[PDB]
Design a protein around this nucleic acid. Structure first.
Ligand SMILES: [K+]
Ligand SMILES: [Mg+2]
Ligand SMILES: [Mg+2]
Length: 135
RNA sequence: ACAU
DNA sequence: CGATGT
């Protein structure tokens, strides 16, 4: 119904899908960029959406912040809830980096606690998520 | 179908 | 138009 402005918003950006993947997190109210991941040579949109949420969880936990996280990705929200990223991306030499990060993100979820609400950004009602890459 |  | 996902 109402945007929770006191929140962190995350999004992926890519060149190709699968392709080069990056992600970032922003203050929903101001758009200030709070973190940005260096581009990963090959990944999928959903792997990047997933890593962005988990990075957000770790970022907020380290800062003792109880703000929620917004993502526009139905898929990534579910993967985080399940602590399991059910990607179809082949595991080979060229995808090793993204899969290492995904494996490590699952491992973090399996060894840490958090109460952060992970909320669906309602693009149809509110426009593009504030972390969007505009592409 | 819906979400990207 | 193509791909990633539930
Ligand atoms: K974009
Ligand atoms: Mg997105
Ligand atoms: Mg976007």
């Amino acid at each position: 119904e109402e945007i929770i402005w006191e929140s962190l918003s995350v999004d992926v950006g890519s060149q190709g899908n699968p392709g080069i993947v990056e992600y970032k997190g922003v203050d929903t109210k101001t758009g200030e960029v709070l973190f940005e991941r260096e581009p990963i040579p090959i990944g999928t949109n959903n792997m990047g959406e997933f890593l962005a949420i988990v990075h957000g969880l770790r970022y907020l936990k380290e800062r003792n912040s109880r703000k929620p996280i917004y993502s526009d990705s139905q898929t990534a929200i579910k993967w985080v809830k399940d602590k399991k990223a059910k990607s179809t991306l082949v595991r080979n030499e060229e995808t090793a980096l993204i899969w290492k990060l995904v494996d490590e993100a699952e491992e973090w979820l399996n060894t840490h606690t958090y109460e952060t609400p992970i909320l669906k950004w309602q693009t149809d009602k509110w426009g593009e998520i504030k972390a969007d890459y505009g592409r």
